[PDB]
Design a protein around this ligand. Structure first.
Ligand SMILES: O=C(O)/C=C/C(=O)O
Ligand SMILES: [Fe+3]
Length: 339
């Protein structure tokens, strides 16, 4: 009963029926509990953010002008820039840090193109029945056209600037534009920055796990190209390699046009564009977190321990002269000593 997932789907204004239905949600092995949906003016929402717990805000007006966005308007106005477009064989996009692909030898799609090229490929695949999937993920730069600049100016900067300030966060590092095909899945990973995830078109189911479920989610090695992503395939979890995935409990919600999901720093998130829900548009706002206090306050937060583990992996990579030695050394350290 408390495993309520995203709950019974919302009704759209003017009796236009449910936004989505449970048939559009993929099916997974683990329980989940709802993320709260609150007004930005609600004290509890501020309490959640202050505490680095996720909340969905319903009424920020953060990206009000972008609500008109759709492929036709974007292609008319987004300029002649190149757009990074990731490709995939299945719904599951796994992403690669390319600087890290030298680290690792035994290793194996990004493509740059114009917006019109992107739309045409979707258009093609659509009327040709192909299985290929595409995800545009491009940070918004200055090539963008007159009307996009204008929309962007009309974002609710008063609100978000106030948050950055209330929270002591660092700088806004980027806005990423994401345009996905229905069914697209970004698998469980974590980011080291604070995120406002501003939904614009279509619906996305967001499954979050707290930083203290690191032991259940089995992130790739730091020097691996898939740094920060879970090794576990949620569709076919290998419980022999990943036994504690049997203990994983998530927080979930479905976001649509106008909702903002606060994804706290180091929270795992798994993001899926609803099946048969059409194309999805989202813009993220990433901020560096607050600086680390004084010296330290113990107990120590889960995300500080994650930070400790990343740094040990990184330093041992420098010291050994070879990221591949990390694992063999780590094992020599614990076997028969700490396990
Ligand atoms: O919306 C996505 O597909 C991914 C978002 C993220 O990783 O923040
Ligand atoms: Fe992310």
């Amino acid at each position: 009963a408390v495993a309520s997932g995203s709950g019974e789907p919302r009704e759209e204004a003017g009796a236009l029926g449910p936004a989505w239905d449970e048939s559009q949600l993929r099916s997974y092995s683990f329980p989940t509990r709802p993320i709260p949906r609150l007004s930005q003016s609600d004290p509890r929402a501020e309490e959640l953010i202050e505490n680095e717990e996720p909340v969905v805000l319903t009424d920020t007006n953060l990206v009000y002008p972008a609500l008109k966005w759709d492929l036709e308007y974007l292609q008319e106005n987004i300029g002649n820039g190149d757009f990074s477009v990731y490709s995939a064989s299945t719904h599951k996009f796994l992403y690669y840090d390319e600087k890290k692909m030298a680290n690792f030898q035994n290793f194996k799609n990004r493509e740059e193109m114009k917006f019109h090229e992107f739309v045409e490929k979707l258009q093609d695949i659509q009327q040709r029945g192909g299985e290929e999937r595409l995800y545009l993920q491009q940070t918004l730069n200055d090539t963008v056209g007159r009307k996009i600049v204008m929309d962007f100016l009309g974002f609710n900067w008063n609100w978000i600037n106030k948050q950055q300030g209330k929270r002591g966060w660092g700088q806004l590092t980027s806005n990423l534009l994401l345009i996905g095909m229905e069914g697209n899945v970004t698998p469980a990973h974590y980011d080291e920055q604070q995120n406002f995830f501003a939904q614009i078109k279509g619906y996305k189911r967001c499954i979050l796990f707290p930083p203290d479920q690191f032991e259940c989610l089995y992130p790739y090695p730091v020097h691996h190209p898939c740094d920060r992503q879970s090794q576990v395939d949620f569709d076919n979890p290998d419980y022999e390699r990943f036994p504690n995935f049997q203990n994983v409990v998530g927080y979930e919600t479905v976001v649509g046009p106008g909702d903002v999901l606060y994804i706290p720093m180091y929270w795992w998130h798994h993001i899926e564009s609803l099946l048969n829900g059409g194309i999805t548009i989202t813009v993220n706002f990433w901020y560096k977190g607050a600086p680390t206090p004084k010296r330290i306050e113990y107990p120590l937060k889960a995300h500080q321990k994650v930070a400790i583990m990343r740094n040990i992996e990184k330093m041992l990579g420098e010291a050994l002269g070879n990221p591949q030695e990390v694992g063999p050394l780590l094992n020599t350290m614990i076997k028969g000593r700490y396990n």
